[PDB]
Amino acid sequence: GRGKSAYQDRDKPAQIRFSNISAAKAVADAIRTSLGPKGMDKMIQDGKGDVTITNDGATILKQMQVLHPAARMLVELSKAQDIEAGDGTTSVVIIAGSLLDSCTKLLQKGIHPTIISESFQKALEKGIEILTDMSRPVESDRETLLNSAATSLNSKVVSQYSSLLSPMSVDAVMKVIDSVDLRDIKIVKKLGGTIDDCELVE
Amino acid sequence: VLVLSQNTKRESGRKVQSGNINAAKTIADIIRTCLGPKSMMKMLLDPMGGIVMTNDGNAILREIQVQHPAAKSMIEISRTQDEEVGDGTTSVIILAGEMLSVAEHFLEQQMHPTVVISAYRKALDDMISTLKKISIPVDSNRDTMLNIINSSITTKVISRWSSLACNIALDAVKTVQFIDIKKYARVEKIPGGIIEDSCVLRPKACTILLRGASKEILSEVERNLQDAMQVCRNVLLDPQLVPGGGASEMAVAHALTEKSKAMTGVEQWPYRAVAQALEVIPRTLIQNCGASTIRLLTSLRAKHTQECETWGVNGETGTLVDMKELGIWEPLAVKLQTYKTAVETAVLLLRIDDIVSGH
Amino acid sequence: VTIVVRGSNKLVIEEAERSIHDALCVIRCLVKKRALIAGGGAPEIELALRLTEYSRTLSGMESYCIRAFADAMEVIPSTLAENAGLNPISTVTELRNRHAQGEKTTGINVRKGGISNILEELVVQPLLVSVSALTLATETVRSILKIDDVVNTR
Amino acid sequence: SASVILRGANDFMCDEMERSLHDALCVVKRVLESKSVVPGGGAVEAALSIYLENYATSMGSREQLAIAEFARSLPVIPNTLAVNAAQDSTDLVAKLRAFHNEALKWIGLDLVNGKPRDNKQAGVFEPTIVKVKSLKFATEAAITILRIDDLIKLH
Amino acid sequence: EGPLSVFGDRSTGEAIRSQNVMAAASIANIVKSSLGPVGLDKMLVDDIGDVTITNDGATILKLLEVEHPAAKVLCELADLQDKEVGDGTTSVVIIAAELLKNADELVKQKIHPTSVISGYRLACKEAVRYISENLIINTLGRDCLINAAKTSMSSKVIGINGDFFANLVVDAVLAIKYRYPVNSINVLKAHGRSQMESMLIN
After folding, report:
1. What residues bear Phosphoserine in this entry (chain E)?
2. Given Cys at both, which of A201, B123, B134, D142 links E99, Cβ 3.0 to 4.6 Å?
3. Angstrom distance (rounded) from CA A79 to CA A60
4. How far apart are CA A24 and CA A36, in angstroms?
5. Contact yes or no for C118/C106 (Cβ under 8 A)
6. D41 has binding-site annotation
7. D148 contact A CB<8A
8. For D142, phi and psi rounded to 5 degrees?
9. Cβ-count burial of E47 within 10 angstroms (0-12 exposed, 13-18 middle, 19+ buried)?
10. Separation between Cα atoms, residue D121 and residue D118, nearest integer Å
11. H-helix or E-strand containing B286?
12. In angstroms, rounded to a whole number, what is the distance separating the alpha carbons of residues A188 and E149?
């Protein structure tokens, strides 16, 4: 009758879970088309008009007005993933939409949401184990450092001078190694000369 | 998809020839009746209760609010023609409309524009050579000039005292004639009295002092006089004159048609189409007389091909008579420019196969 | 340190800044973790395989869900072949097999139209990006799967 | 610089003759810009059409149809030229191909006459640089639109 | 969710890629009839009422009120094509649309656009080579220019005397042509005397 405030939403267990999965999965399949070296850009023209054509999931979700809460969760994954690793920001979202996709089946079957949440977590512990268990352990060594700095500067416009940007990125970190803090590596883009003249001021 | 801004109409190909041609043809049939001494002056009532009574095609096109660009280009055709000499403003419009009316037909037979236009532009060149190949070269000479200037003052509000105005225009033009300059004849109109109290004021540039009982009448005496001076400006550049009453149109027609069979090919039809189009002048002419246009056309080309070109449509008698004998002559320049301004317009108009607007 | 980035064109410099920024991120993630894996679907399938087995062994709702969890990993490689023109479903199973015969590095080269050794293709990502990915999204899925109500007046 | 004094009995004449004086002002230029040039009329596009058609059959995989179509999006130039020149596209277009592999490259469409003519012998030449940019731009133009799965313009 | 509230664009799936084709189509076909010596000019009359009758595809796409983003791409091509060579501006817009249409076919066959794109790229590089192998490398020619000058004026108001000028056109170019600077050929128009006395101050 009149127990809820005028104009108010009250989604029940079976009702709410549905909306969330939808909102998320919808947002996932949205940026799931820009993933990969052949991804597709999305022109994000907000209200003012300032377009933001970006391929990165995070930048896409951070420019998109998000009204529903559940889908905002994904925007948090993209941001976090882009601050905890940088790349693969589009993956965390897609996978998230998938994990939700398969679990729903279980829900519409007769599996309590909790048990599922417990199971998935158990698989996570196993997942991280195996992955890391077979990862090639690398070395300080300036060699391997230029490997994660070179193969990471390609496919872009800096690839033309990645051979120089890599060393600087290695010296910029090699010094801030008090764990590395990206706040001690002040970056300043100036207009003069070329990218081949760039320098790393200690 | 919105290839182009929402609500922006874009006619393409055949959808353009239709809306463009007709619109122009229709606007040409509006002032059509206002042709000849039997003109049917329309009473233009703007969207505010206005009452515009006139015969001139230009003045009419400047009162009728048009929206379609095609009909707008026409109002521009009458703007250029009306500025040069003045009269015949409806002529150039009626022709430009007909040419599109006869063209569209060929479009029905699926005659690609490229071919058509090609024949139109070339046909235009034929009329020019024709006009000169039959013009009657008349003398300067005060006497002649008078007649020429008179015929340019026998249809307006100044016709009342045309004789006086003539001597005034004749003097103003014969004096500022070095090629005569139409900027050396100052017109000093002064309200009061009758147009009969006028007198040319003398000089590398006189100062004609007109007089007008009213304010509207005085400005009219200025314009007609200027036109009376124009024809005089033509006898200095184009001392040629061809018989009016349609006599001209018929000639060029009978000539062009004959040339058609000599050229053959696909363009063999357009040639005739243009010639048959020139027949509208004598046709609509006799029509304003309530006589049989068809019948007249028959007897017209009849005695015309048999006994010289001196024959034309006599509206007062509703029959064909020797224009030359009656003393009906029109400056070759008058006709010269007409066919030109007409064909040209129609030509490029036919090149328009799309118009980017807003709605 | 203070990296000075001076270039001719702004779009060229801004790209240098962004790219170098990423050249560091991957390294900053390599400091707290000196590991690297061939990124390209290899790690996803590898997990999807182990987890699936980790399911049959565990058994019960646990197994079911887990298998589902792992199957959710097959999306990473599928999209790859998808956004490459290759048949997603077919390319995947193709990798799953070669992943058991070849090695963990066995991934999908979206530039050859088929399976191949990613470790020899010069395609590796720091173990951190991965580790995080699974944790980040997984916890979330659990954070909103718990919310049994969403009523906040107006 | 220069000073081409263009007369005219009427301003309406000086306006179109000035617009015409600019047409052959840029033709005479392209003809001497760069030594490399090609016989217009459609010859070029025609060549690439058949050649690329064979290239597709030698590549295989999805790239066979991808290149095939491309070779079908090239003869569209001479096809349209004939349409805007009052000529039956299909006819000239097809006839061009046969006359393009018989009298060599120098065989394009002469809209003026309306028949496969030797543009090289006729004098119809356009700086290859134009062709390059034409393709390059047009191509890149597609890749982008095909790279669009969704957008967000908002009022 | 309620991402982009009222007044918000965003096209996904086939609903968009298609819209782009038709978008490039309508635009293409437009200036498609303006190529050749018998070009069919158009009368661009913007909002302010200014009438602009032109033949160049670029000038048409720069005065055409376009709303859809994709269609604007063609206007950019007509721009790049106009600031690099000039003529053929319509061609780049025509071939562009066609390539798209031919693609849709492969699309309705289940061939992801990525596969097609890779096809237009390799084909492009090759199509250009096939051109480079048949590049008539001459040193300009006159006899050829006059013909492309006499027929480029035979459809307007200067067709009657398209000869006298055609010459004045091949002369003004070859005279101040290195790269032919168009800013060096002024066409001073003055009333008086027929178009026959049109001279070219040498």
Report:
1. 5
2. D142
3. 10
4. 20
5. yes
6. yes
7. yes
8. -75, -60
9. exposed
10. 5
11. helix B280-287
12. 56
Which string of DSSP letters, residue by residue, matches A160-174?
A: GGHHHHHHHHHHHHH
- Reading the block at residue B87, the tokens are 């009269």
Specify the DSSP element, H or E, that contains A15: helix A13-31
**Cα gap D150→A30, rounded to integer Å:** 8
Helix (H, G, I), strand (E, B), or coil: what is residue E190? coil
User: What is the 3 state secondary structure string of chain C?
Assistant: CEEEEEECCHHHHHHHHHHHHHHHHHHHHHHCCCEEECCCCHHHHHHHHHHHHHHHHHCCHHHHHHHHHHHCCCHHHHHHHHCCCCCHHHHHHHHHHHHHHCCCCEEEECCCCEEEEHHHCCCCEEHHHHHHHHHHHHHHHHHHHHCCCCCCCC
Pairing of strands C125-126, E136-137: unpaired
Cβ-defined contact of C37 to A103 (cutoff 8 Å): no
**Resolution rounded to one decimal, in angstroms:** 5.5
- Spatial contact of B212 and B192, defined as CB atoms under 8 Å apart: yes
Please check whether residue D48 is in contact with residue E135, taking contact to mean a CB–CB distance below 8 angstroms: no
Number of H helices and E strands in chain B, helices first, is 14, 11
Whether the CB-CB separation of D9 and E190 falls below 8 Å is answered with no
Long-range own/partner contacts, residues E173-177 (CB < 8 A, 24 or more apart): E173/D24, E173/D25, E173/D26, E173/D27, E173/D28, E173/D29, E173/E145, E174/D28, E174/D32, E174/E140, E174/E142, E174/E145, E175/D2, E175/E202, E176/D1, E176/D2, E177/D28, E177/D29, E177/D32
Cβ contact, residue pair C19, A157, below 8 Å: yes
The backbone torsions φ and ψ at residue B249, rounded to the nearest 5 degrees and listed phi first, read -45, -45
Question: After which residues is the backbone of chain E broken at C–N > 2.5 Å?
Answer: 139, 178
Q: Under DSSP, is residue A28 helix (H, G, I), strand (E, B) or coil?
A: helix
Which among B274, B250, B247 is positioned nearest to B260, based on CA atoms? Answer: B274
Q: Tokens at residue E58, please?
A: 């670029």
Tell me which chain A residues have a C-beta less than 8 angstroms from the C-beta of D151.
Answer: 42-43, 45
Helices (H), chain E: 14-32, 57-61, 69-82, 89-107, 113-132, 143-150, 162-176
D124: left (phi over 0), alpha (psi -120 to 50) or beta: beta
Q: For residue C41, report the phi and psi dihedrals to the nearest 5 degrees.
A: 110, -20
For residue D103, the surrounding DSSP H or E stretch is none
Termini Cα distance of chain B: 18
Determination method here?
Answer: X-ray
**What residues of D are in contact with residue E174 (Cβ under 8 Å)?**
28, 32
CA-closest candidate to residue B221, choices B209, B232, B233, B207: B209
Structure tokens belonging to residue B310: 């001196």
The DSSP line for B317-343 is TTEEEEHHHHT--EEHHHHHHHHHHHH
CB contact at 8 A, E66 and B1? no
Report how far residue E27's alpha carbon sits from residue E97's, in angstroms, rounded to the nearest whole number. Answer: 9
Query: Smallest Cβ distance to C132: which of A81, A138, A156?
Result: A81
Cα-flanking dihedrals φ and ψ of residue C126, to 5°?
A: -60, 135
- Judged on CB neighbours under 10 Å (0-12, 13-18, 19+), C4 is middle
Residue C24: which of A78, A190, A182 has the closest Cα?
Answer: A182
Residue for token pair 């993209």? A78
Kind of pairing between the strands at C114-117 and C106-109: antiparallel
CA dist B7 and A114 (Å) reads 55
Phi–psi pair at A185, nearest 5 degrees: -105, 75
CA closest to A70 among chain E residues:
E1
Output the six-digit token pair for A153.
């500067």
Name every chain B residue with its beta carbon within 8 A of the beta carbon of D12: 80
Q: What is the distance between the alpha carbons of residues B77 and A31, in angstroms, rounded to a whole number?
A: 59
Residues 84-143 of E with CB under 8 A from D: 84-88, 91-96, 98-103, 105-106, 109, 111, 113-124, 126-128, 130-132, 134-143
> In degrees, to the nearest 5, what angle opens at C-alpha B299 toward C-alphas B294 and B302?
130
C54 CA: distance to closest CA in chain A (Å): 8
